[PDB]
Amino acid sequence: LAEVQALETLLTRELSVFLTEPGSKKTNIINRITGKTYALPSTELLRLYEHLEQCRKQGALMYFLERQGTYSGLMLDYDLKLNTNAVPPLEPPALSRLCHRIFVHIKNSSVLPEGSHKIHFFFTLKPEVVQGKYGFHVLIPGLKLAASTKKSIIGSLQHDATVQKILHEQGVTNPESCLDPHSASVPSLLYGSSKLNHKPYQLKTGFELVFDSSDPDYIPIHQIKNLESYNLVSELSLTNEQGSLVRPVYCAAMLHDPEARYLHKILNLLPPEYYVEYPLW
Amino acid sequence: LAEVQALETLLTRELSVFLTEPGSKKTNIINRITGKTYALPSTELLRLYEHLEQCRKQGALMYFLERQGTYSGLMLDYDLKLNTNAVPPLEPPALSRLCHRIFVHIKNSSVLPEGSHKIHFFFTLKPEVVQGKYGFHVLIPGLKLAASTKKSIIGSLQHDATVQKILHEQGVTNPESCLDPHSASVPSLLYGSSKLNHKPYQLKTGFELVFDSSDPDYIPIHQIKNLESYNLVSELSLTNEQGSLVRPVYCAAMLHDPEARYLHKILNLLPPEYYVEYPLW
């Protein structure tokens, strides 16, 4: 495929010069398919996002992660157990109310800057329910938060009675324990990417929330209408600062490497029945 | 015109039996063109609304008023003085915020019933600015309020700093004194009707507000999308209780006929300074 070939050329010929060592904090981008780690400057991050976006629109297999580090956008990872194997409705009013409640906790952290600011919420959903297991990500990529503040906001969100109600009325049986408390620290999948055993989450709905410190009781939340007009890998990225839709608002602060060849014996080192080993160890 | 002929037949042959005397309290409907007053039961009100709606869709001259009486929907009459003769933008975010502020005053009146309820807001706008004079009606027809509560809500709304800001940013030079304090008591034009010297206000945008006593901080406001699907004379009526979109929520308790011919005489009669006449009376 042309756009995959283009991404391959960008990675090997050009971005190879930004390859980081294993466990290097400088790392912002992880390609879990090639097992490569990169520290991309903003210019080269954007070029990557243009290629990943073209690959996304053609349904290409991607497994890119961004590292959140100490100061970046907020991601909420919900792992739902459902009543049934039916995708829950999750219509705009429920998602709109979720945004409001998420914002109340952000505001209560006291780190928002004074003045008038737009922040965008994006809901990406697991494409199907598998054995009653369902998922969504809430991405607030533009709202640049300290890791410690994200952890605090996530702690508060787990105990939110209104959020638990919304999730319950959607058919969620684990509304108390569905929000991953490590949402603040885990590397976050780029839009169009997934674990190799899963399919990528799909953008259902995005919302624009405006807050004004002078008028704190007015918190307008509206659906974003022309989402398709933007580079979604770009806009949804927690570490991006050069989005068009998403403009930053700054808040107060495995080594065996088989390389697709040697792992085959791994596939037959599991179904030995060799638990008990008197001579067989 | 057929639909005007139909309305004429309904009024003279059928509804004539509901004609009220001048100053009757039973009156709910006033036809200021025919100078007739009626007390229509709900069945005959609906039949009227079907005919008025057909007449409205064909741009027919109507001057129907409904009397608010002591318990009915809320109407806000804004008379704006503007910076310019340009229609102010009044886009959904400004109107959405207006609804929220209007609701805060309704809630503060303490008369809302407990539980979950939808209430609809409709904004009808003066079709053009004339010498910087502009207008809109806010109709909350489903929210059945005591006259005394409406007066109280209107009093509070006049002094609302956020509403004054919104109106100021629209180019309103009288944001302190543009809301008619008699909005609670005046007879209210049916949708498609107007004073004989004015053109009828046009429905620009309607909003659905859901309130829940159990979850008071969640106040979702969304544009209504399929407005054209409904009988708008019917839905927008403050005294109607049998709308399809608008379901009631119960809160705690001369003749001119110029035919475009003598308007010329009015236009040439006023300019002389002969209002007093000692030799030419």
SS (H, E, C) chain B: CHHHHHHHHHHHHHHHHHECCCCCCCCCEEECCCCEEECCCHHHHHHHHHHHHHHHHCCCCECEEECCCCEEEEEEEEEEEECCCCCCCCCHHHHHHHHHHHHHHHHHCCCCCCCEEEEEEEEEECCCCECCEEEEEEEEEEEEEEHHHHHHHHHHHHCCHHHHHHHHHCCECCCCCCECCCCCCCCEECCCECCCCCCCCEEEEEEEEEEECCCCCCCCEEECCCHHHCCHHHHHCCCCCCCCCCCCEECCCCCCCCCCCCHHHHHHHCCCCCCCCCCCC
* Helix, strand or coil, per DSSP, at residue A264: helix
CB-based contact (8 Å) between A96 and chain B? yes
Angstrom CA distances, A178 to A146, A167, A171, stand at: 23, 9, 12
A133 min Cα distance to partner chain B (Å) = 28
Q: Which of A62, A71, A36 lies closest to A145 in space, CA to CA?
A: A71
| Amino acid, res. B207 | F
Edge-to-edge strands of the sheet including B36-38? B36-38, B29-31, B64-66, B188-189
Burial class for A23, CB neighbours closer than 10 Å (0-12, 13-18, 19+): exposed
Residue B238: count of CB within 10 angstroms of its CB: 25
In chain B, what residues touch A210 (CB-CB under 8 Å)? 93
User: How distant is the alpha carbon of residue B80 from its chain centre?
Assistant: 15
Q: Which of B47, B60, B45, B49 is nearest to B3 (CA)?
A: B60
Q: Return the number of other C-beta atoms located less than 10 Å from residue A17's C-beta.
A: 8
Q: What is the DSSP letter of A6?
A: H
Nearest to B220 among A96, A104, A217 (CB): A96
Please identify which residue in the block is written with the tokens 């004054």.
B164
Chain B interface includes A97 (CB < 8 A) = yes
Q: State which amino acid sits at residue B44.
A: E
**DSSP bridge partners of A117:** A211
Q: Exposed, middle or buried by CB within 10 Å (0-12, 13-18, 19+), for A149?
A: buried
- In the three-class reduction of DSSP (H, G, I as helix; E, B as strand; rest coil), residue A45 is classed as helix
What dihedral angle (degrees, nearest 10) is formed by the CA atoms of B258, B263, B268, B271?
Answer: 110
- Compute how many other C-beta atoms are within 10 angstroms of the C-beta atom of residue B17: 8
Q: Tell me whether residues A162 and B218 touch, CB distance under 8 A.
A: yes
Residue A49's nearest CA partner among A248, A247, A242 is A242
- Cβ atoms of residues B73 and B140 within 8 Å: yes
Pick from B158, B201, B205, B173: nearest CA to B85: B173
CA A220 to chain B, closest CA, distance in angstroms equals 7
List the structure tokens of A78: 């919900």
Taking CA–CA distances from B101, the nearest residue in chain A reads A218
Give the count of alpha carbons within 13 A of B261, CB side only: 3
Compute, in degrees rounded to 10, the torsion defined by CA atoms B163, B165, B168, B174.
50
The SS3 call for residue A253 is: coil
**CB neighbour class for B64 (10 Å; exposed up to 12, middle 13-18, buried from 19):** buried
Chain centre to alpha carbon of residue B172: 20
Cβ neighbours of residue A143 closer than 8 Å, sequence gap 6 or more:
A73, A74, A106, A119, A249, A251
- Interior CA angle at B17 toward B14 and B23, to 5°? 130
Find which of A163, A222, A225 to mutate to test the B interface (most B CBs within 10 Å of its CB). A222
Residue of B91, B160, B217 to mutate, interface with A, max A Cβ within 10 Å: B217
Q: Alpha helix (H) ranges present in A109-224?
A: 147-158, 161-169
Which alpha helices (DSSP H) does chain A contain, by range?
Answer: 2-9, 42-57, 92-108, 147-158, 161-169, 232-236, 264-267
Q: Do B215 and A165 touch (CB under 8 A)?
A: yes
CB under 8 Å to A56, separation ≥6 — which residues? A62, A191, A192, A200, A232, A233
Strands A71-81, A116-125: pairing kind: unpaired
Looking up tokens 């064909």 gives B58
The residues, ordered by sequence, that sit 6+ positions from B152 with a Cβ below 8 Å of its Cβ are B109
Q: Report the side by side order of strands in the sheet with A29-31.
A: A36-38, A29-31, A64-66, A188-189
Judge contact between B206 and B123, C-beta under 8 A. Answer: yes
Nearest to B97 among A92, A97, A218 (CB): A218
Q: How close does chain B come to A170, measured CA to CA in Å?
A: 17
Minimal Cα–Cα distance from B116 to chain A, Å?
Answer: 14
Q: Two tokens at A127? A: 């494409």
The neighbour count for residue B221, using CB atoms within 10 Å, is 21
Q: Cα(B158)–Cα(B101) distance, rounded to whole angstroms?
A: 11
Contacts of A164 (CB under 8 A, 6+ apart): A175, A176
Whether residue B93 and residue A217 make contact (CB cut-off 8 A), yes or no, is no
In angstroms, the CA A157 to CA A161 distance is 9
Query: Is residue B172 within 8 Å of B81, Cβ to Cβ?
Result: yes
A101–B220 C-beta distance less than 8 A? no
Within 8 A by CB and 6+ apart from B60, the residues are: B1, B3, B4, B7, B192
What is the spatial distance between Cα A143 and Cα A237, in angstroms, rounded to a whole number?
Answer: 11
Residue B275 touches chain A, beta carbons under 8 Å: no
Radius of gyration of chain A (CA): 20
Q: Say how far residue A17 (Cα) sits from the centre of its chain.
A: 26
Q: Are B101 and B175 in contact (CB under 8 A)?
A: no
Pairing mode of beta strands A133-146, A188-189: unpaired
Q: Please report residues of B whose CB lies closer than 8 A to that of A217.
A: 100, 104, 162
Rounded CA-CA distance A188/A202 in Å is 15
Do the chains contact at A222 and B92, CB–CB below 8 Å?
A: yes
Can you give the resolution of this entry in Å? 3.7
Distance CA B129, CA B86 (A): 6
Instruction: State the Rg of chain B over Cα.
Output: 20
Which amino acid is it at A279?
Answer: P
The H or E element that residue A203 is part of is strand A202-212
Distance CA B263, CA B268 (A): 9
Type of residue found at A280: L
Experimental method: cryo-EM
Nearest CA in chain B to A100: B218
How many whole angstroms separate alpha carbon B177 and alpha carbon B160?
Answer: 11
The residues near A256 (Cβ < 8 Å, ≥ 6 apart) are A262, A263
Which residues are CB-contacts of A86 (< 8 A; sequence separation ≥ 6)? A129, A171
Query: Could you count the other beta carbons within 10 Å of the beta carbon of residue B244?
Result: 10
| Dihedral angle of Cα B123, B165, B105, B250, to the nearest 10 degrees | 10
Count CB atoms within 10 A of the CB of residue B214.
11
For residue B123, list its beta bridge partners. Answer: B138, B205
